[PDB]
Amino acid sequence: TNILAGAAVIKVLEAWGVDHLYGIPGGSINSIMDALSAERDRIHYIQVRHEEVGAMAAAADAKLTGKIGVCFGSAGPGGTHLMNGLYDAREDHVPVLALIGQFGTTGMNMDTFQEMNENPIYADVADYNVTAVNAATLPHVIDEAIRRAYAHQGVAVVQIPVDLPWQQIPAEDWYASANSYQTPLLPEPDVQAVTRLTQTLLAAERPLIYYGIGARKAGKELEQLSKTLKIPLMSTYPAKGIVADRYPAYLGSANRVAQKPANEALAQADVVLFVGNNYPFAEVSKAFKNTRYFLQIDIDPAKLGKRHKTDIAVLADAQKTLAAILAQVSERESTPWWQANLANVKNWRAYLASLEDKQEGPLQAYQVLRAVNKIAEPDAIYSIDVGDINLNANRHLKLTPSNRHITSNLFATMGVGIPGAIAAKLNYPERQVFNLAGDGGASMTMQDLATQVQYHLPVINVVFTNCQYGWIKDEQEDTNQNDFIGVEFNDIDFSKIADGVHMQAFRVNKIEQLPDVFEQAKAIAQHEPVLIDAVITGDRPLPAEKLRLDSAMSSAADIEAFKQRYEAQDLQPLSTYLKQFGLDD
Amino acid sequence: TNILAGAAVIKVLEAWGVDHLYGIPGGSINSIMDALSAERDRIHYIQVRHEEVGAMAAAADAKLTGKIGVCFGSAGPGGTHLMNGLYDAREDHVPVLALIGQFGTTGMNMDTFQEMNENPIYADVADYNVTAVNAATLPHVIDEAIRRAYAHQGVAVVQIPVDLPWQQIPAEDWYASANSYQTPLLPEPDVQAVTRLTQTLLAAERPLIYYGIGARKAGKELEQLSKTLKIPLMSTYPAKGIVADRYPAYLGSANRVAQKPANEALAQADVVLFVGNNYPFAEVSKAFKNTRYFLQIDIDPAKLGKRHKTDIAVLADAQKTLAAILAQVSERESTPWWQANLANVKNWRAYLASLEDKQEGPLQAYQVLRAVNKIAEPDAIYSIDVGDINLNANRHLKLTPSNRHITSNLFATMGVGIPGAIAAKLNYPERQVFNLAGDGGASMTMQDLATQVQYHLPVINVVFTNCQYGWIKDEQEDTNQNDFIGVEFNDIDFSKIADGVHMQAFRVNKIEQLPDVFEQAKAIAQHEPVLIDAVITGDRPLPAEKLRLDSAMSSAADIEAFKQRYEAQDLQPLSTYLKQFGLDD
Amino acid sequence: TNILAGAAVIKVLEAWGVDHLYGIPGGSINSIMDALSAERDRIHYIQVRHEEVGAMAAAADAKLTGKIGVCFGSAGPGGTHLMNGLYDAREDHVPVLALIGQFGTTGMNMDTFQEMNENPIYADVADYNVTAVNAATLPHVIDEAIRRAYAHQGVAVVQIPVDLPWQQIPAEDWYASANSYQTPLLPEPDVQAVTRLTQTLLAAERPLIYYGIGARKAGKELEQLSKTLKIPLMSTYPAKGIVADRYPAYLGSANRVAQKPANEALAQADVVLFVGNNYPFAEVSKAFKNTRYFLQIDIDPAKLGKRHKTDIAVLADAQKTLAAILAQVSERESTPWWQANLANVKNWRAYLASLEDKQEGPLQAYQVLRAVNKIAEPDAIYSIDVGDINLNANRHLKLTPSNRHITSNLFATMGVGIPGAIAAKLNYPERQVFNLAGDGGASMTMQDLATQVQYHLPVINVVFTNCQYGWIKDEQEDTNQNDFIGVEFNDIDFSKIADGVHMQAFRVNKIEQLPDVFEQAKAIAQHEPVLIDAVITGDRPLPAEKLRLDSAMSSAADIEAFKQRYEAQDLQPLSTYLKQFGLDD
């Protein structure tokens, strides 16, 4: 006949299939805590050590599964701790529900302890942002929040005065709209636009297909189009893995978290098919300045012609359209453009292998990532933090459609390593999970290594200890007139941190130590989390956006300096392979 | 003839006497980094491990010295990390300048990497919140920011597109207005209002003077008024120390971070002189429901009659007015009210001493704070985190006008322990500095123990490890119907954390271990930071807001249960002492 | 080689097909004015007398044509005047671009004249809200604004520092993405879902189809489904006219801007097909409290199960879905439910006709609307203000698919009549256009009658002068315990107002005056605007939400007072017709 409004709120979450949620309790949220406590069997509460880890893990939930992630923070500081995760969810356009504690309605606007107007705090990050003021409608407001987060692919925030969830409401009034939820049936891709787009791509002398995660369902089609038409593939960094890295005509990604062949080919291309792609460096890097025809496939009207003057922009699903293209084309013989690219990729990969294959001496990030590769199961999930690791993992990880990898793509918040791995292991307890993090990022969220221990989540944590914000140091080397500042700092021994949180750990600093430590980590991680602290050199990884290899473009002095610094003696510029197969620049 | 706008910005900071500032660099703030790098001799940059520690330490700077604290974060996640500190500065009404990184003006609004409209993020927390759009006026905007932060006692935020500080500006145009800065000369307190207020206080049969930090300059006058007029003193928690704790008629503070005698006396008082006080529990706890006359002294017109219907509210400086009162009164003989209170205080203090004086057995927070007292120099500064520690430190620390103590008073953000101690040691390198923190709060900012090590800041860190959010667990015991949730968690060994950051540390769990460990900590801290991890029991400290000691108010069953739980067999209720000296309730 | 940024911005607007835009110049927007001036042959600036009218006209443009409306206001007060129109655009979810003047980037943040941070002002209303900081990127930011406003169906606001449009940019870099524009994809109905929905609809004893403007393209399908299946139709008020009003099974709308048969039928329905409908009164009025099954069709996932729990929800285009239902059903025989409703409608229409058909005496709103009907062309466009006129127009206008009517549906801002008619006549110079408005609403925007004069826009303005806010007076009558306040005021003669702006006008107060005044107006408006000021009685229109006609529910005394007040002696309650055909209430 009556139900507590809090109990009904948890039933709304359960109706929508929310399996787990994150936060830290407080007085301002103890009535939501009270409802969660009665429902331990149906919904799994994860107590984190800092509320940003809960928000980040909620975002990672949605990134991995497509289902709304859920977090909460108490009034004031609990809620404002959420911000780095909430902005990550906004920028990465994934559905997240955030519940914020608030003092009871009798105490609001009284200027009492930790009481403030919380609504303005969340106005910018949130697609939906409301303070609940009635217990009876509270389940509806939560339901509304979830449904809007899904529809708009962003953050819904509800501030909840603590009195409301302890109030009785009629047991029969409230409902969830989970049962109405569905995905649309779209028409077939516009037939005549697709045909026209196909002709333009096929008429190109130096075509590229450049996809992002919008093409995540189209791995098979992308690779078959490439093979059939002899058109090299490049992607955004996040789209690594959609097509297996081993594919010989995968060029990699452009800009900085980038691979040499992709940057080089992009500069030469006359036609780009830009699919499911919102590459944020398009305009600022002038990526398409020499492109003749720009073709686009996107599902979002807001993206149409956004990144470059577009000759044909098809509004449609990536996979459906690429399938439609493939159904109207057939085999083309190998071209000079194709052979030059394949050769360029081969050369690039032998370079990366030479870095990986060093057997002895001072540990670099390159051999550490080889060691990850050697213990990695074919369906492992990588939660990647922010810094050099994005660049190194992009180059070195050997990913297939079976893998997943996540980072903070566009907000680029450091600290995501640990929470992303926690979310990954909670959703996929049977899959191997890595957290690959630099020392600066790992230290931002280090306390939540304890959360992995507490909830028995067998993450393999690999910390890359360079004693630097390496990513930023390299930027300062490029732009700053004065000395390095704030980018070299004191060592933290993360194997001791892990010990302090009661996690098994190792610290290595020599290449020859890798195989036995990674073997042990692999085994330990059948049951318990583990951390390897890899003490690495401060060597700058090859800057793909600053290549000095082409005689027509750079001085011999610049080239020899570059080859020396980046162990790049055997790298050839693309022009070498173009000229080899009869092409100019 | 020309100067870099960034170089001029640093000269503005130097003009205002900014000694040190906190942050983490990024590409979006590397031009401000570049200017800081040339000015290492005049301004000291502190690289923190998480930007919330920089914001919190900036707030603590202003709390301790009265001078603007300065922090920065890079675009996106660097800036949003600042939030817990910035809200602490807003709520604690201290001047803070926060600089936020932003992409260059050529890239703004392009939807590029980590680029967003940052202005809405800071609208709620900031008294002043602007995006700079011109290099030439940039020093003025920073100057304006600082001057408004001081004038309005809050947070000024400036978002800085990274291109601007690398632009040349005329060397002679920019200026700082530091030279104009002054404090007002106020008239004398309103003579006739003060006289009238004095008569009402003196006519009271059960008077109290109840001061907050607004009376920080009036320690001498407060204590002499009390002694002369025979009027017991109570304060807000933050106002502990203004009058020495040893003063026999100091009652303590009310509510929860509270002391028994203050709560009891407040309930009996017929007249309260409320001075420099903005107690946030006034209305919600109905603190003054039985008060006959409410008198107020405050410097802020916004506070006048804010917390209770006020009979006389003098707009004036606390110290000046209390001095003016003292100059028109003379000795009154001891009264029953005064003797009852003195007796009540004595009884209370013998209780606290009995907890402190245990010599052997399971370690409690009480003996740990005694151990702090025994190594504490008379002018030590305490940076206190948030939770049971506020309640325990308030009761146990033996403070005089020579000490300072700071916490997050009203925003009550956990994590402030470490940054507050960092700020304290940077401002006062010759004073002993403690960080007193619970395990939940210490773990939120644990990474910045490394900042103490890096900058050789000899903080004595004392972590109270109960494996609980004890403050919240006790709240759940009081309000929640269902089981404890999110309040008991896994151990973190902070002596291992400290080892991992290369700090000397100890872990203790027995009362008998205290003296030698604290002696070692004291010595180590002559040159280097140190941490003591105190493993304590989960005993609930006596709830001063839930006393069960008075036969007229509670059942004998409730009283015996209370005495048992809180080792309170020898505590008597105030009514016992009132009746002893001839008074009723 | 170069172009002025402001020139490039106007070219973007031209590429997007903007014909006209509204606003008022100022110094802070004179460089955009300058660009507009050079371009007066290709894009048409409409100078209004108040910026709210320009914003409301822009919203109405988009409401009428689906093409983005464009307005602007100068720095400070110019832009804040836009708000009521911008909020109308947000709530009615139509694309609007608002350009806001701002001081030059050299004077921004200097606290100069009318200079402020303008960005927080627009954060709440706007889908996209940015301050431009670079001239080269300005055309892009404008293009970005328009694309987003279209895609997200809402307001894009750009604050433009005045220096930027006077700066030269490379002539060959900027582009518009207008060429790439597409409308969102129309999802298809699941076949099995539609079959399940149809069978639930056919099994109903008391079915209703209840459509909103989401079904504006499915009038034919709605009417054929009603005829074929013998299922009565009802709509939201904005959906009036999608099916011709003369259709004998059209019940009208529910709640207050409502018709008696729709409210009565809805109360009795067992099954509702809710199509392209977001009726904001669903929950608060408990519209569906006795509905057994609720079937929903909507294109927006955010609406599915929002207003009631669904038994079947179809995420698809309304017309595609309704066409699919119609294709799987055949002719059904009449039912008692069908007949009772047909009879209820006949009774209701005879009541409205009796009101309209009065030939002499004190003028009421009803005969004024009859006079509108008599001069109205089959494809007239009605811009309607806010108040009694929504209720009266809803009952009396005889609309068909060939008409359009607009008001401020959801924000419900008064004053929209005048600007909506301005926009109407600009978009459809060969269609007859009415502005129907109460005296309160006409007053708010009365100065822009001068705008119709200035641009020679032949609107037929009809003001309903009751010297009251009648809508609000009636509410006070219903809820307030004390006397009317603020709801009856002094007369304004709008024929004199019209004379003052140099518009031909009449003032009438008797029923017998209408035919000749309206014939004159009809003729005048072949070439120029005209105004009819109709002095009407203070009669309350029949409250369809407070029917007192059924003696099983109301006292005989309440029924007679209701019949007498509303001239409803011949109205019968639905239960009369349900009983005639053998059904209970």
Ligand SMILES: Cc1cc2nc3c(=O)[nH]c(=O)nc-3n(C[C@H](O)[C@H](O)[C@H](O)COP(=O)(O)OP(=O)(O)OC[C@H]3O[C@@H](n4cnc5c(N)ncnc54)[C@H](O)[C@@H]3O)c2cc1C
């Ligand atoms: C430190 C760091 C540095 C980085 N630098 C780089 C870098 O140098 N190089 C790089 O490549 N990346 C880099 N990034 C990642 C980068 O910022 C962007 O997030 C990324 O390039 C955008 O990738 P995307 O287009 O695949 O994803 P999104 O921006 O999510 O875009 C997805 C697109 O596909 C569309 N879409 C979605 N579903 C469909 C569908 N079914 N059909 C068709 N279209 C669909 C969407 O509308 C959208 O346009 C970096 C990240 C980090 C953390």
Ligand SMILES: Cc1cc2nc3c(=O)[nH]c(=O)nc-3n(C[C@H](O)[C@H](O)[C@H](O)COP(=O)(O)OP(=O)(O)OC[C@H]3O[C@@H](n4cnc5c(N)ncnc54)[C@H](O)[C@@H]3O)c2cc1C
């Ligand atoms: C976990 C936690 C729990 C807490 N709970 C309690 C509790 O139970 N009990 C408790 O006492 N505190 C508690 N607090 C602290 C509490 O929230 C408030 O911050 C505190 O009570 C307010 O103290 P105040 O009035 O001294 O300071 P403020 O709020 O800063 O007020 C200062 C006042 O003095 C005025 N003023 C400033 N200068 C002058 C001057 N020169 N002359 C005259 N007036 C001046 C100001 O205008 C203002 O009114 C808690 C803190 C924490 C972290």
Ligand SMILES: Cc1cc2nc3c(=O)[nH]c(=O)nc-3n(C[C@H](O)[C@H](O)[C@H](O)COP(=O)(O)OP(=O)(O)OC[C@H]3O[C@@H](n4cnc5c(N)ncnc54)[C@H](O)[C@@H]3O)c2cc1C
């Ligand atoms: C003074 C005043 C009083 C009012 N009171 C009343 C009242 O008493 N009664 C009343 O009815 N109205 C009233 N309103 C109007 C009211 O506030 C709402 O705007 C209206 O009822 C909602 O109508 P709607 O659902 O047609 O419009 P919207 O709220 O615009 O909803 C349209 C729906 O259709 C969906 N849709 C859009 N396109 C498609 C498609 N192709 N296929 C399927 N679905 C689609 C959308 O997702 C949306 O859910 C009043 C207005 C005024 C000015």
Ligand SMILES: CC1=C(CCOP(=O)(O)OP(=O)(O)O)S/C(=C(\C)O)N1Cc1cnc(C)nc1N
């Ligand atoms: C400091 C920093 C970075 C350095 C990361 O240092 P790490 O030690 O984690 O990584 P490595 O490069 O040394 O291997 S990257 C970065 C970007 C990409 O914006 N920032 C700026 C930044 C600063 N602060 C936060 C919370 N997030 C950020 N992204």
Ligand SMILES: CC1=C(CCOP(=O)(O)OP(=O)(O)O)S/C(=C(\C)O)N1Cc1cnc(C)nc1N
């Ligand atoms: C979790 C918590 C608290 C528990 C602190 O746990 P601790 O372990 O630090 O302290 P103890 O009580 O166990 O000795 S106190 C609190 C208040 C006063 O609001 N909150 C809510 C809270 C939650 N999150 C943040 C960042 N700040 C907060 N103040």
Ligand SMILES: CC1=C(CCOP(=O)(O)OP(=O)(O)O)S/C(=C(\C)O)N1Cc1cnc(C)nc1N
């Ligand atoms: C005063 C008023 C109304 C009265 C309208 O007075 P009118 O004189 O225009 O209409 P009438 O009813 O007398 O024919 S309706 C209303 C609604 C529906 O919200 N409001 C409140 C209102 C008040 N102010 C504005 C700008 N918009 C509003 N909608």
Ligand SMILES: [Mg+2]
């Ligand atoms: Mg590093």
Ligand SMILES: [Mg+2]
């Ligand atoms: Mg604790």
Ligand SMILES: [Mg+2]
């Ligand atoms: Mg009126």
Ligand code: NA
């Ligand atoms: Na942390």
